[PDB]
Structure formats: C-alpha cells, structure tokens
Design a protein around this ligand. Structure first.
Ligand SMILES: O=C(O)c1cccc(Cl)c1
Ligand SMILES: O=C(O)c1cccc(Cl)c1
Lengths: 500, 500
C-alpha cells in the first residue's frame, strides 16, 4: 500500500524546498522540508507525553496551518485522528468523544467547549492547539521518534457522517491512496510542482482532507490554507497564488461565480484549471452560472465519507447525472433487498458501490449501523438512483427523504428545486405528512423572502405551470418564518413534521 | 490492493459495450463485455486441461488480439504468465523455460521453435496459440471457473530483463496498480472512454503490458493492436482511430516524426495528446524532430522492469535529464557502496530507487542476482547518474559500460552520440580496451555508411572540434564492417573487446 505518511514523506524527498503550505493572510509559507521538521517534532512531543500508536485523538478546529501540522503529526506518531466539525454543539462533541473512547482531544474551539469536555465523563486529555503549534512554530521536546508499522486494514483516521448523532466512520490505512488518486483519474490532476490547491473545503470532511490537503502535498504541490471563506478574497487568492485547482461546495461556487461575474476581466483567473464539486443537490441555475462565469474544467463528483468517490462527470449539463470512474463498481438494487437484486433498467432503486480498497471498515462501536451499511462486499449509499437511457446514473434523493404517496415514489429534492424558483421563496422543504390520499401526503413548508407574503393558492398555481407530473404537486402548504435546523445547518425533517 | 484482473473486470462493468480492442487491419473490434466473455472461456478451458493457479506459463508471441486474450485468460485462471521476447533464439527460449520450471508454454512462433522445446528437457506442455484463440474466437469447454484468491506479495507475472541470459523478474500482485497509474500521475492520462491507446510497444515489455495494454483497458479505453509496425501506416491509425496517447520507442519516434514531416497537414494528428517514451538514450537530434514534427504533450520517462517508473519530464529539452514523480523515491549513492552512502552533490554515482509497491520481488531462481539488486529496501538500477544544479537527475550510462581511464569516469554513450553525428558514420560503439595510459584506454569502433571510407585521423579531427573534454576523446579507432549483436539487437560489448 501507500499510506498518508508515506505519500507525504516521499513528496518531501522529491520537493524538499518547494512551498507546501501557504497562508497568504498571516504571511506564512513552509516548504515540504520544513513541514516534515514540524510534523516530526510535534509527533515526538506528543509521544513524550504518553500518546502511543492506534489510540484515538480528537481534533476540533477550524482550518489552519497549525491543525494541518497537528493532524499529520498525530498520523506520523501512529495515533488515529478523529476529525470533528467545530460547529457542533459543545454537548454533542463531548458525547462523541466519550462514545469514542478517545485518549486525547486537540482543540482550537473556545474556552466553553473545553469546559464541556472537562465535565462530560470520559477521561480524555484536553490539549490546546496553541500548546502544540502556533503560526507553524512548534514547542518540541524529546528525541525524534520511530515510525510505527502500519497495516493495510488497520484504522488510520476517523471522519464523521450524520436520524440522530453522527457516526464515526473508520478509514483504514489502505484507503488513503485511492482517496487521493481519484483526483487524478477522475479530475485530471497530475504529479507536479505546478500544483497549487486552494483549501476551501473544511479539513474534517474527507474531501477537504484526502482529496484536497493530502492530494496537494502528495503531488508535490502547495496547499493554500483558507481560515475563513470570503468570495472576492478567495478569487484574489486564485490570481495572486496561481491556484490551479479548486474543490468547493455548491454554496461556495454560487458565491464565487457571482463575484467573478461582478469582477469581470478585473480578476485574472487564468491559472485555474479544475473547478470540482459534489453537485448532486446543485440547482440547475447555480451550475449554469458556474459554466458562464468561472474558468477551468468543471467536474461534478458523487462520493461518501464511507467510500469516497463513486461517480463523476466532466463538463456537467445537470448536477444529478453522473457515471462511475476508476476504482468504482456500482449497482442499483431494489430498495431494502439484497445486493444481488439489480433493478430492471429504468426502475428506481438504491445506489450501492463496491467496498474495495477506499472503503471504511465500520462505524466505531456501532456494529448494527455497520451491518446495515456493509453487505456481502458492497457499501449501501442510502441514496435513490435510476439508470438513464443515456448510460448514466441519476441520483434522485436520500432513501430516507423519499415520499411514498399512493404507491408512488416522490423525491422532495425535485419539488424543492422547482418551488425554490417561485418568486418570493427564500427556502423550502418538502415532506410527506402522516398521511392520506394515502400512505403519505406531499406537503411543502416554505419561508418567504424578507417582507414578502406567500399564499398556498399562488404557490399551487406556480407548481401547476412547472414541469411536475400531477401526483408530485404538493397537496398542502405551510408558510413558516423559518425552518428548524441543527448545529450544522441541516434541516430537521423528523422534527418539522411534528411541528406541522 | 487492485490487481490486473480486478482492474479489467471493474472496467468491463463500467463500460461493458464500449470498444476494448481494435485491430483496424483484420477488421476486428471487441467491446469490454465481449473481452470478459472470451477471457472467461479460455481461462476455464485451460483450467479444464489441468492448469491450476500459481503455475508459471510461458508466452512467446508477437502482439495480437489473441495473445492479449490468452495472457489475460491465464491471469484470470490464476496462472503466472511469463512473457518472453519472440525474437530470442530457439535455444535461449528453451533454456529459460527449463530454468523456469514452467508448466506450459503458449506459442505463436513457428514450428522450429516448438521443436526446440519438444527436445530441450523440461516437461512443459507446448500449447499452440491458435489452439486457444483465433481472431478473437475461442474454442471453449467446461463450466466457467472460480476466481482464485490473490495476495499482494504473491507472484502475478514474469517479465525478462537482459552479462549473459535474461533474468526472470517476478512481478507481485500488488504491483499492477502503480504500474498503471503512473500513466496518470506522470503522463496525464485520465479515466474515460475518450481513451484510445496505440499499442506499438511489445507486450513482453512491462511498458507494453501494464503502461499500455492494462492502462488502456483499466481507464475504460481502447487498445489499438499493432501486429507489425510501419511508420506511415501507424500515423494513419492515429487519424483513423482517434488515438489519444502513444508510447513508443526512440526508434519508432524517429520513424514517425520523419513520416509526419513528409506527410504535413496531409495527416490529421490532432486527436493525439500524449507522445511518451523512454528517452535516456535518445539523441538530441531525434528528440528535436519529435517536438518539431509530432503533436501532443511529450513526456520522457525513465523506468526499469524491476521498479517500473522512477523519473520523468514534461516537454523535455534533452533526453537524459529527468526528475522523480509520484510513487518514486530516489537517491544517488557511491558506486559499489551502501544504500546510505549518498554522494556529494555533483559527484557521479549509482541511481537507486525505493523498492515500494511497484517493485519486483526477486529474480526467479537467482537469489544472488536478487541480493545484488534489492538491498535494505532499495532497488539498485546499475545506472550511473548525477544531480544537476537544476535539481534534476542526469542519467549518464550503465555502470557496466563505464570506462575508467586514468582514475576518471568516462561514459561511452556520451562519446557515441558525438561520433554518431560525424559524417560517414552509420553506427558506433565505444569501449575501454584492456588497458593503459592506464586502467582502460578509450577506444571507438565504427561502421561506415554504405560505400563510404572512414579514417582514424578524420574521426579524431572531428572529435577535436566537438565539445568533448580532452580525456574523453577516443585514443584509438577500429573501422569495422559491422558490430556483433545478439538475438535482440543489443551490442555484445564483452565480445567486441575480444575481437579487437
Ligand atoms: O461527501 C461527499 O460529497 C464526497 C465524499 C467523497 C468524494 C466525493 Cl467526489 C464527494
Ligand atoms: O524499461 C523501461 O525503459 C521502462 C520501464 C518502466 C517504465 C518506464 Cl517510464 C520505462
């Protein structure tokens, strides 16, 4: 195999004096060589404090040079970093560290979340990030440390997914490579010092970590650190930094396209060759501004924390329609049936992908969840798809959001995309109320633009003019001043239902 | 890991009805699906005849659809294909199969080489290629067969290198992937059905096999079969077939460039994006015509049967100067010293590369050769290199050809490139005679162009005007009507020496 440490280390030997990390704001640059030295020194410093290999350690921090150093230093020691979204509720992070049986937690959130841990229960050493690394500068003690043996199926890193409370997906050693290389086979990145990769994706997301951070370094390139996203600022980075590739969320891309469109030839974005994104949920409108207004080849990708990348499209026409590339094997089976029950072609079903090398090896301490998800060699996405006559896979929506109304499959995502273009709608979620006509009644929950009124009549009329087939039209509307959302801004479908 | 079988099989599921193999002459095309079916059927047919997994089987045949089918069918059964240059002497092939303890030999050479085996000694079943597959059509019996378990370090394929009698390098299961993917990280190939790969490299060479055949299929592309190389014909294939990438020997590239230059816009070569080659030995003159006259990005690569790819250059200025890319780790140590004795920067030494995943695991039944070559984690190239101030590696020549004259390192390849431009020289080899001034005397052996005379005086004078430093100039000349060469056209340096 080739592990993360080994990928980064080989790079450092090929390009020791080349720029590895930049923070244009803060004015900090480290070569690959210098980043070894800092990773090494931390690794042994933590080692000198008791931490041994295979012990899980939490990392709760916004993107920064210092967290890149800390995460890699932990991998280099042999520890298993558990990367956690810093926007989670204090209570939730503590629960996931207790459930996690974790030896330490590296934190750069504030004093009040360190308190949450102080109580909480689980004896996990609370390490302040700035007690390890500040502005790329470690405080290091002890001799340098040995490189532990790593085994292909051995746990390497822990990323979190998301009913209630995110699950800790275990990423084995053997998975790093194809979690990086798919950026090359699918997206088109090649090895080389021209590589300048803008880090807009958070590091607690596998894409932000393997596909953006590790890729950048392992291709002997430069990771440009982005502590805080701002659309015009970010475009200045592309120009100033010679960014060659960018992997962004749909929301970022909307922002960047809108700025690019109101910069004009003002910004030189010529250096940028790859605009990548997971756009299954990307509305047609946003995608379009992306082709009109941003440069470089656009690639749409579908992936999961559990299996990384499973489908893609060069130069996408719509964001839902993709096709498997290198490393992947995929199938559409009957919902709730065995992994061998393929569908008739054109019937809807569950997207399952083969659980090859890139696959997670289970959820930490949730072997029931695991057995719902890894079956007879496959990984079950929980997403609904259909095969297009065109030979491509069309992702329709989550199995869990699917509305079954009078023996018929309805996907709220479709209906939400139409309704979201109705004038006066700022936000919409479609749920299936419990439930008649029967089984389930298609219902729309909509939030008006500031100061505007909506009426059920006018939205209905709008829907009537849309392309939706009869049965897909909402049977009811609730105009709300807002939708209840979690810590990470996801809509609480289970809960909204109750409230209506 | 991802094995060859598994790479090809996944492809077949992604692109079942896409063209896998073409033979434009012969008018034959097989989709990926159809190629599974034929690989499957052979595999079980051989299986039904006694052949079980891990048993070595010889393959002696010029490039053709049928040998692609046969080699893959053997891998699919579990057998270990030993691929052998068909231009070897009857006697030599037999010796390598006896030494090989091989269970069968698949042959498409003539009746007289089958005789060589008939005698020879080793009880190895002589299978005629056309007894398995003719024009993509198998004669198959028995039920389909089980897919054997394959293990990362387990032998997978056997390729031959070349003093006397080629060594059988064992290629483990785990090596296929990065032997393919380096075409993507270094050369720039991406996954996709646009991929149309011209097979000019012989299949008994690892590049011809992993980097060209397996790459083409595994990227869901098309391998264009070339039974017999002809420069204009081959350029017609690029145009007619929409060839996107081409990996060629230096001799092929000279031929193709010269034809391209005397076609002109006559041939549309636009579809061709990658012209790849191993050009360490490529004269400056030929490389230049390649940039002037052929399209697509040109990439120079350095590799070995033992470790595959170890250095490269996009848009090369000279063919000797390269730099390591993804998967590689390299060092220049003192000649004949330990793998840790790096050289002072600017001093010449032996190029060693790390023996990672892509590495062979030893020479079949030659554990002394193996221990000369795999040391303390490294693979020893037997090539001399130097680090350029520019941060690149300059390959100077084979350790074995190096001439040591009065305590000074002389590389005949350098002196041969100069002398080969002297007017009237058709062919030149520089050796070091035994040996004074001392140690060794630099001597040139030259063959005149048809009907021309050479004299030692005139060549000397030519050399005097060249860039060569004093000590590099030949001290003697022997004008010969030809050089003694082996079966595979390599010059017999040991032997020439005797004759002079
Ligand atoms: O979480 C995602 O959307 C994701 C995860 C891995 C790979 C890709 Cl393309 C997308
Ligand atoms: O044998 C060669 O020249 C060779 C073998 C493997 C890879 C490459 Cl780039 C070259």
């Amino acid at each position: 195999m080739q592990t993360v440490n080994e990928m980064l280390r080989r790079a450092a030997t090929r390009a020791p004096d080349h720029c590895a990390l930049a923070v244009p704001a803060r004015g900090l640059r480290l070569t690959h060589a210098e980043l070894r030295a800092r990773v090494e020194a931390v690794a042994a410093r933590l080692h000198a404090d008791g931490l041994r290999p295979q012990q899980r350690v939490a990392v709760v921090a916004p993107n920064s040079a210092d967290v890149v150093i800390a995460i890699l230093a932990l991998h280099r020691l042999g520890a298993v970093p558990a990367l956690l979204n810093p926007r989670l509720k204090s209570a939730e992070l503590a629960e996931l560290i207790k459930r996690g049986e974790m030896t330490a937690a590296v934190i750069a959130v504030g004093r009040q979340v360190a308190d949450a841990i102080f109580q909480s229960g689980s004896g996990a050493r609370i390490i302040f990030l700035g007690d390890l690394v500040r502005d790329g500068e470690p405080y290091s003690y002890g001799p340098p440390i040995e490189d532990p043996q790593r085994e292909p199926a051995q746990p390497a890193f822990i990323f979190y997914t998301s009913t209630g409370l995110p699950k800790a997906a275990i990423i084995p050693q053997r998975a790093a490579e194809s979690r990086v290389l798919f950026m090359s086979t699918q997206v088109g990145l090649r090895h080389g010092r021209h590589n300048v990769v803008l880090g807009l994706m958070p590091l607690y997301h596998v894409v932000g970590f393997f596909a953006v951070l590790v890729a950048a370094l392992a291709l002997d390139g430069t990771y440009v650190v982005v502590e805080e996203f701002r659309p015009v600022d970010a475009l200045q980075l592309v120009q100033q930094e010679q960014v060659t590739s960018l992997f962004a969320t749909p929301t970022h891309l909307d922002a960047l396209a809108a700025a690019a469109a109101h910069a004009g030839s003002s910004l030189k974005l010529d250096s940028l060759r790859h605009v990548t994104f997971a756009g299954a949920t990307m509305p047609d409108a946003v995608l379009e501004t992306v082709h009109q207004h941003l440069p470089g080849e656009k690639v749409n990708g579908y992936g999961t924390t559990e299996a990384m990348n499973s489908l893609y499209m060069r130069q996408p026409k719509t964001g839902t329609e993709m096709a498997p590339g290198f490393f992947s094997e995929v199938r559409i089976v009957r919902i709730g049936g065995g992994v061998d029950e393929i569908v008739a072609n054109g019937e809807e079903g569950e997207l399952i992908v083969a659980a090859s090398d890139s696959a997670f090896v289970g959820y930490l301490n949730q072997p029931q969840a695991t057995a719902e998800k890894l079956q007879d060699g496959w990984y079950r996405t929980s997403d609904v798809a259909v095969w297009t006559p065109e030979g491509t896979v069309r992702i329709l929506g989550r199995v869990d959001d699917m509305i079954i109304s009078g023996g018929e499959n309805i996907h709220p995502s479709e209906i939400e995309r139409v309704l979201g273009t109705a004038p006066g709608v700022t936000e919409v979620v479609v749920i299936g109320l419990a439930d008649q006509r029967w089984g389930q009644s298609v219902t729309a929950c909509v939030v008006p633009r500031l100061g505007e009124t909506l009426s059920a009549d006018a939205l209905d009329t709008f829907c009537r003019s849309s392309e939706l087939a009869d049965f897909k039209r909402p049977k009811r509307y609730f105009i709300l001043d807002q939708l209840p959302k979690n810590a990470l801004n996801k809509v609480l479908r289970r809960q909204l239902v109750q409230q209506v």
